[PDB]
Amino acid sequence: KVTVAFNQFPENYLFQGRQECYAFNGTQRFLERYIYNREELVRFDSDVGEFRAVTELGRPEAEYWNSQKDILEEKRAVPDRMCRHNYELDEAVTLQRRVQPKVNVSPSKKGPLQHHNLLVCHVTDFYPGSIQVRWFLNGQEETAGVVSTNLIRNGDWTFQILVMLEMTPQQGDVYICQVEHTSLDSPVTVEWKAQ
């Protein structure tokens, strides 16, 4: 697994860099970014084929680097060298990572059956992030009254999400949270019955 060389040009100063590989279908698009603090200075974009000065402070490098055939050919060769190579490895491993969602259902408050409450479907510790969470009342999907936080990244290669339903439970009402995910052969369902 490989990388490529960046080109060379109280108080705090910072310099940042990005080497980005965008995989789409079977193609690779490569971006190289040079950044002073939060300001992008010079960019290489494989779709352009050469360096572009984003700011005036990046103009000398952009112009000089573009006059070096060898520097350009090294960068133009990146999509088919570094990007493809690292991607094939991530396809074989990272993209095979499957972690099953745990599903928990609980009312936001416990108590009577007179008035509104929130029924919370808490779905945790799954990967990858693409997921479908549905609420059912007595066998019928609920579209209204569904309040979701969106996908929450835990930062440890797992996601969670909370999808809650505005409800007014009557005795003998059946609520189901249905979860579908690529790691699951069949959907996970958790049932909560009003009592």
């Binding site: 697994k1 490989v2 990388t3 060389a5 960046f6 080109n7 060379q8 040009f9 108080e11 705090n12 100063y13 910072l14 310099f15 940042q16 860099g17 990005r18 080497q19 980005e20 590989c21 965008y22 995989a23 789409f24 279908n25 698009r29 971006l31 040079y34 950044i35 002073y36 603090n37 939060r38 300001e39 992008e40 200075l41 402070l57 990007c83 690292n86 991607y87 490895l89 991530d90 491993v93 990272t94 993209l95 990572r97 745990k102 928990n104 609980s106 808490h122 945790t124 510790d125 990858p128 992030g129 929450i152 990244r153 835990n154 930062g155 440890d156 290669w157 797992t158 969670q160």
Partner: protein, 181 residues
């Protein structure tokens, strides 16, 4: 840019601590980084460490070039220092909260610049030094940063938590409060 997946080497060097960082992310999750003191590659999961390798020297060489670029840009910009962008802070559990059941508190600190922070966990007003962990300073596409702090704990009806965050963009230290329910 249209893509199924985004694979990114992100790196920075700065004058204040931490002075350098080199990492690779896949779809916005950090897969590995180079420990610049130990001069070795550190994998986020054992899954990756067993299947993949990376020559840490590749990262070390790019850091050195980045440092030269910093030196050059401090002068060319007439010592231009960026504005301090304060962080948003959120606290949330990893697992559904059950009294007596081991869980992990997550403090997420987002959208800040520069990557210079002080973070402290507080339990009932007192600092916690055991069972704590943290992510690297993670890059954002807007060139600001985010970061995760972690605390393992056992939820109880008695205990109260705060995530205490210091950053130059804040007028005063920020506390985000959390309780088990």
């Amino acid at each position: 840019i249209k893509a199924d997946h985004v694979s990114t080497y992100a790196m920075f060097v700065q004058t204040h601590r931490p002075t350098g960082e080199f990492m690779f992310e896949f779809d916005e999750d950090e897969q590995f980084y180079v420990d610049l003191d130990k001069k070795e590659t550190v994998w986020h999961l054992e899954e990756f460490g067993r299947a993949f390798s990376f020559e840490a020297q590749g990262g070390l060489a790019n850091i050195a070039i980045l440092n030269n670029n910093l030196n050059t840009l401090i002068q060319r910009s007439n010592h231009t220092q960026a504005a301090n962008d304060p962080p948003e802070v959120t606290v949330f559990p990893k697992e559904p909260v059950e009294l007596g059941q081991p869980n992990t508190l997550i403090c997420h600190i987002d959208r800040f610049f520069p990557p210079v922070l002080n973070v402290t966990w507080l339990c009932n007003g007192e600092p916690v030094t055991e069972g704590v962990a943290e992510s690297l300073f993670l890059p954002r596409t807007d060139y600001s940063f985010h970061k995760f702090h972690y605390l393992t704990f056992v939820p109880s009806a008695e205990d109260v938590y705060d995530c205490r965050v210091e950053h130059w963009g804040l007028d005063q230290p920020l506390l985000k409060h959390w309780e088990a329910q």
